[PDB]
Amino acid sequence: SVYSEYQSKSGVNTNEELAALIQYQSSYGAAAKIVSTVDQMLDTLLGLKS
Amino acid sequence: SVYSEYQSKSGVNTNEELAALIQYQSSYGAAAKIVSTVDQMLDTLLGLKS
Amino acid sequence: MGIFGTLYTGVTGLKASEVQIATTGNNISNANATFYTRQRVVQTTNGYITT
Amino acid sequence: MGIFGTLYTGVTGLKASEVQIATTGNNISNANATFYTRQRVVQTTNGYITT
């Protein structure tokens, strides 16, 4: 029992981390195109300064 | 339950505001050129009176 | 000639355009720090009369 | 946020994914480094700044 009692809240397994990865799957996917979008927009205001 | 509701109440988003607000400026910037365009009428009048 | 003064005054109105650069950049700022509360925009009432 | 810090903050979002995913793979690697307790990466923000 205690021996079995180090594989649900402490250590490691499958799924729990996999779910986390997919959130990160979204995380960078959104982050990058948001970032580049912002960069492209810097360009717009730059051309506005003109 | 109380969890679910706040995430809806946590509605503070930031992305699409980018498209709208940049243009409110860029329109003025795209206007500033015409503002100069009519402004330069004064400049040309000045050149004439020289 | 005095109307020329209106022109720089218009530029002050144009500087009102710049804030929406500040707002859009600032508003975009909150990436997923899951602890944020928004800050939001205003428009004003006015009235002006002559003699 | 300032434009440069702002676009920098998006990099932090990319970095968050990077560090997070690196941790996730690490945990995945730890799936039989069985002694590994959950080590956690948490969202923070670049602090309050003058504006």
mmCIF file of C-alpha atoms in Angstrom:
data_model
loop_
_atom_site.group_PDB
_atom_site.id
_atom_site.type_symbol
_atom_site.label_atom_id
_atom_site.label_comp_id
_atom_site.label_asym_id
_atom_site.label_seq_id
_atom_site.Cartn_x
_atom_site.Cartn_y
_atom_site.Cartn_z
ATOM 1 C CA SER A 1 0.000 0.000 0.000
ATOM 2 C CA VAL A 2 2.578 2.575 1.081
ATOM 3 C CA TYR A 3 4.875 1.243 -1.635
ATOM 4 C CA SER A 4 2.083 1.723 -4.168
ATOM 5 C CA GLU A 5 1.613 5.100 -2.491
ATOM 6 C CA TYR A 6 4.299 6.928 -4.493
ATOM 7 C CA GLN A 7 2.748 6.951 -8.063
ATOM 8 C CA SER A 8 -0.548 9.368 -8.031
ATOM 9 C CA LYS A 9 0.359 12.784 -6.263
ATOM 10 C CA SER A 10 4.302 12.668 -6.121
ATOM 11 C CA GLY A 11 6.283 10.885 -8.910
ATOM 12 C CA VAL A 12 5.320 10.388 -12.566
ATOM 13 C CA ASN A 13 3.246 8.476 -15.101
ATOM 14 C CA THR A 14 1.576 8.956 -18.466
ATOM 15 C CA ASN A 15 -1.298 11.272 -19.358
ATOM 16 C CA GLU A 16 -0.880 13.880 -16.623
ATOM 17 C CA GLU A 17 2.201 15.353 -18.308
ATOM 18 C CA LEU A 18 0.781 14.674 -21.767
ATOM 19 C CA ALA A 19 -2.223 16.883 -21.024
ATOM 20 C CA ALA A 20 0.221 19.582 -19.925
ATOM 21 C CA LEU A 21 2.171 19.276 -23.175
ATOM 22 C CA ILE A 22 -0.934 19.851 -25.286
ATOM 23 C CA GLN A 23 -1.697 23.031 -23.371
ATOM 24 C CA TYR A 24 1.843 24.025 -24.274
ATOM 25 C CA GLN A 25 1.069 22.746 -27.764
ATOM 26 C CA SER A 26 -1.436 25.585 -27.862
ATOM 27 C CA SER A 27 0.805 27.910 -25.873
ATOM 28 C CA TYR A 28 3.680 28.396 -28.313
ATOM 29 C CA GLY A 29 1.458 28.017 -31.366
ATOM 30 C CA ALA A 30 -0.508 31.058 -30.257
ATOM 31 C CA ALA A 31 2.490 32.884 -28.796
ATOM 32 C CA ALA A 32 4.594 32.884 -31.964
ATOM 33 C CA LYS A 33 2.001 34.211 -34.410
ATOM 34 C CA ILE A 34 0.894 36.732 -31.799
ATOM 35 C CA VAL A 35 4.537 37.786 -31.514
ATOM 36 C CA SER A 36 5.127 38.045 -35.264
ATOM 37 C CA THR A 37 1.784 39.802 -35.683
ATOM 38 C CA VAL A 38 2.929 42.413 -33.165
ATOM 39 C CA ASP A 39 6.191 42.783 -35.083
ATOM 40 C CA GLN A 40 4.317 43.283 -38.351
ATOM 41 C CA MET A 41 2.278 45.935 -36.574
ATOM 42 C CA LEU A 42 5.366 47.742 -35.377
ATOM 43 C CA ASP A 43 6.065 48.072 -39.054
ATOM 44 C CA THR A 44 2.699 49.702 -39.675
ATOM 45 C CA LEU A 45 3.260 52.439 -37.126
ATOM 46 C CA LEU A 46 6.780 52.840 -38.450
ATOM 47 C CA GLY A 47 5.460 53.481 -41.942
ATOM 48 C CA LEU A 48 2.991 55.867 -40.353
ATOM 49 C CA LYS A 49 5.791 57.883 -38.784
ATOM 50 C CA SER A 50 6.997 57.733 -42.344
ATOM 51 C CA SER B 1 -19.442 25.244 -10.127
ATOM 52 C CA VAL B 2 -17.930 28.366 -8.592
ATOM 53 C CA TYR B 3 -14.791 27.458 -10.542
ATOM 54 C CA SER B 4 -16.599 27.265 -13.872
ATOM 55 C CA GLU B 5 -18.340 30.611 -13.504
ATOM 56 C CA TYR B 6 -15.261 32.749 -12.870
ATOM 57 C CA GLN B 7 -13.343 31.501 -15.893
ATOM 58 C CA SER B 8 -16.212 33.062 -17.798
ATOM 59 C CA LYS B 9 -15.951 36.056 -15.453
ATOM 60 C CA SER B 10 -12.195 36.033 -16.108
ATOM 61 C CA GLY B 11 -12.995 37.301 -19.600
ATOM 62 C CA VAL B 12 -9.977 39.611 -19.834
ATOM 63 C CA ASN B 13 -8.640 38.944 -23.345
ATOM 64 C CA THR B 14 -6.034 40.925 -25.306
ATOM 65 C CA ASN B 15 -5.616 39.600 -28.857
ATOM 66 C CA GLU B 16 -8.308 40.937 -31.191
ATOM 67 C CA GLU B 17 -8.058 44.395 -29.618
ATOM 68 C CA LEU B 18 -4.814 44.624 -31.613
ATOM 69 C CA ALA B 19 -6.626 44.741 -34.955
ATOM 70 C CA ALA B 20 -9.149 47.388 -33.914
ATOM 71 C CA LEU B 21 -6.991 49.859 -32.000
ATOM 72 C CA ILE B 22 -3.986 49.997 -34.340
ATOM 73 C CA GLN B 23 -6.283 51.232 -37.087
ATOM 74 C CA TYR B 24 -7.901 53.987 -35.022
ATOM 75 C CA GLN B 25 -4.382 55.408 -34.935
ATOM 76 C CA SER B 26 -3.319 54.368 -38.435
ATOM 77 C CA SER B 27 -6.455 56.039 -39.771
ATOM 78 C CA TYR B 28 -5.321 59.250 -38.084
ATOM 79 C CA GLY B 29 -1.834 58.607 -39.431
ATOM 80 C CA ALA B 30 -3.346 57.933 -42.841
ATOM 81 C CA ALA B 31 -5.237 61.150 -42.137
ATOM 82 C CA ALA B 32 -2.144 63.026 -40.966
ATOM 83 C CA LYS B 33 -0.791 62.790 -44.513
ATOM 84 C CA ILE B 34 -3.918 64.443 -45.906
ATOM 85 C CA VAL B 35 -3.715 66.878 -42.988
ATOM 86 C CA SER B 36 -0.272 67.772 -44.273
ATOM 87 C CA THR B 37 -1.661 67.700 -47.815
ATOM 88 C CA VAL B 38 -4.046 70.533 -46.996
ATOM 89 C CA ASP B 39 -1.491 72.003 -44.594
ATOM 90 C CA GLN B 40 0.992 72.318 -47.437
ATOM 91 C CA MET B 41 -1.519 74.573 -49.128
ATOM 92 C CA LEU B 42 -0.384 77.130 -46.591
ATOM 93 C CA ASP B 43 3.235 76.338 -47.365
ATOM 94 C CA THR B 44 2.665 76.860 -51.074
ATOM 95 C CA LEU B 45 0.858 80.117 -50.420
ATOM 96 C CA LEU B 46 3.876 81.182 -48.418
ATOM 97 C CA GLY B 47 6.205 80.241 -51.233
ATOM 98 C CA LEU B 48 4.080 82.276 -53.599
ATOM 99 C CA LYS B 49 4.059 85.371 -51.421
ATOM 100 C CA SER B 50 7.829 85.071 -50.916
ATOM 101 C CA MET C 1 -2.783 83.700 -40.157
ATOM 102 C CA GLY C 2 -4.356 83.004 -36.786
ATOM 103 C CA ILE C 3 -6.053 79.987 -38.365
ATOM 104 C CA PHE C 4 -2.519 78.629 -38.653
ATOM 105 C CA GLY C 5 -2.755 78.189 -34.896
ATOM 106 C CA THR C 6 -5.669 75.832 -35.492
ATOM 107 C CA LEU C 7 -3.308 73.557 -37.404
ATOM 108 C CA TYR C 8 -0.976 72.791 -34.501
ATOM 109 C CA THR C 9 -4.109 72.377 -32.397
ATOM 110 C CA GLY C 10 -5.200 69.724 -34.876
ATOM 111 C CA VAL C 11 -1.847 68.044 -34.295
ATOM 112 C CA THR C 12 -2.762 67.854 -30.612
ATOM 113 C CA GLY C 13 -5.883 66.041 -31.764
ATOM 114 C CA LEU C 14 -3.580 63.865 -33.849
ATOM 115 C CA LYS C 15 -1.577 63.085 -30.714
ATOM 116 C CA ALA C 16 -4.869 61.705 -29.415
ATOM 117 C CA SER C 17 -4.255 59.124 -32.145
ATOM 118 C CA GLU C 18 -1.012 58.041 -30.472
ATOM 119 C CA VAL C 19 -2.682 56.819 -27.281
ATOM 120 C CA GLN C 20 -4.435 54.081 -29.238
ATOM 121 C CA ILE C 21 -0.937 52.880 -30.017
ATOM 122 C CA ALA C 22 -0.362 52.940 -26.265
ATOM 123 C CA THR C 23 -3.710 51.301 -25.527
ATOM 124 C CA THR C 24 -3.380 48.556 -28.129
ATOM 125 C CA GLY C 25 0.176 47.781 -27.068
ATOM 126 C CA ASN C 26 -0.694 47.948 -23.379
ATOM 127 C CA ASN C 27 -3.966 46.061 -23.771
ATOM 128 C CA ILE C 28 -2.221 43.305 -25.732
ATOM 129 C CA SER C 29 0.353 43.137 -22.943
ATOM 130 C CA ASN C 30 -1.430 40.585 -20.749
ATOM 131 C CA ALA C 31 -0.151 37.280 -22.027
ATOM 132 C CA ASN C 32 -1.347 34.268 -20.017
ATOM 133 C CA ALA C 33 -0.515 35.487 -16.575
ATOM 134 C CA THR C 34 -3.702 34.053 -15.124
ATOM 135 C CA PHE C 35 -4.242 36.861 -12.616
ATOM 136 C CA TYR C 36 -5.362 39.944 -14.580
ATOM 137 C CA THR C 37 -8.346 42.288 -14.494
ATOM 138 C CA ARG C 38 -8.452 44.446 -17.674
ATOM 139 C CA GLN C 39 -8.372 48.227 -17.955
ATOM 140 C CA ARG C 40 -10.782 49.839 -20.394
ATOM 141 C CA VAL C 41 -11.608 52.952 -22.446
ATOM 142 C CA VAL C 42 -13.824 56.039 -22.064
ATOM 143 C CA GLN C 43 -15.573 58.735 -24.101
ATOM 144 C CA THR C 44 -16.772 62.072 -22.754
ATOM 145 C CA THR C 45 -19.804 64.382 -22.845
ATOM 146 C CA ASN C 46 -19.454 68.025 -23.860
ATOM 147 C CA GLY C 47 -21.319 71.217 -24.715
ATOM 148 C CA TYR C 48 -20.249 74.674 -25.919
ATOM 149 C CA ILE C 49 -22.166 77.922 -26.475
ATOM 150 C CA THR C 50 -21.382 81.377 -27.854
ATOM 151 C CA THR C 51 -22.188 85.038 -27.217
ATOM 152 C CA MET D 1 3.675 47.459 -21.263
ATOM 153 C CA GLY D 2 6.384 49.140 -23.310
ATOM 154 C CA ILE D 3 6.503 47.957 -26.907
ATOM 155 C CA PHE D 4 9.929 46.388 -26.528
ATOM 156 C CA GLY D 5 9.156 44.745 -23.216
ATOM 157 C CA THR D 6 5.725 43.953 -24.639
ATOM 158 C CA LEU D 7 7.048 42.017 -27.618
ATOM 159 C CA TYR D 8 9.659 40.733 -25.172
ATOM 160 C CA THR D 9 6.789 39.521 -22.992
ATOM 161 C CA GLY D 10 5.471 37.462 -25.900
ATOM 162 C CA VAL D 11 8.906 35.858 -26.009
ATOM 163 C CA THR D 12 8.407 35.091 -22.328
ATOM 164 C CA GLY D 13 5.225 33.337 -23.414
ATOM 165 C CA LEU D 14 7.323 31.416 -25.920
ATOM 166 C CA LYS D 15 9.913 30.890 -23.189
ATOM 167 C CA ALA D 16 7.188 29.704 -20.821
ATOM 168 C CA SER D 17 6.168 27.102 -23.388
ATOM 169 C CA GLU D 18 9.841 26.282 -23.927
ATOM 170 C CA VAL D 19 10.691 25.872 -20.249
ATOM 171 C CA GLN D 20 7.340 24.202 -19.596
ATOM 172 C CA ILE D 21 7.669 21.722 -22.449
ATOM 173 C CA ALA D 22 11.290 21.083 -21.502
ATOM 174 C CA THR D 23 9.970 20.296 -18.028
ATOM 175 C CA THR D 24 7.203 18.161 -19.525
ATOM 176 C CA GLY D 25 9.684 16.113 -21.525
ATOM 177 C CA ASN D 26 11.838 15.964 -18.415
ATOM 178 C CA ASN D 27 8.893 14.598 -16.451
ATOM 179 C CA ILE D 28 8.317 12.242 -19.374
ATOM 180 C CA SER D 29 11.966 11.246 -19.080
ATOM 181 C CA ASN D 30 11.328 10.972 -15.341
ATOM 182 C CA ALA D 31 8.568 8.430 -16.016
ATOM 183 C CA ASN D 32 11.141 5.809 -15.017
ATOM 184 C CA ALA D 33 13.505 8.031 -13.109
ATOM 185 C CA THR D 34 10.792 7.014 -10.682
ATOM 186 C CA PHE D 35 12.294 8.920 -7.738
ATOM 187 C CA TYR D 36 11.334 12.224 -9.408
ATOM 188 C CA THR D 37 8.628 14.047 -7.478
ATOM 189 C CA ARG D 38 6.599 16.647 -9.346
ATOM 190 C CA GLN D 39 8.694 19.722 -10.019
ATOM 191 C CA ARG D 40 6.573 22.667 -11.038
ATOM 192 C CA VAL D 41 6.860 25.745 -13.240
ATOM 193 C CA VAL D 42 4.467 28.568 -12.405
ATOM 194 C CA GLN D 43 3.235 31.680 -14.165
ATOM 195 C CA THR D 44 4.515 34.997 -12.874
ATOM 196 C CA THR D 45 4.618 38.476 -14.392
ATOM 197 C CA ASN D 46 7.271 41.082 -14.871
ATOM 198 C CA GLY D 47 6.431 43.335 -11.977
ATOM 199 C CA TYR D 48 4.731 46.717 -11.686
ATOM 200 C CA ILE D 49 6.429 49.372 -13.814
ATOM 201 C CA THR D 50 6.162 53.153 -14.040
ATOM 202 C CA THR D 51 3.650 54.360 -16.616
#
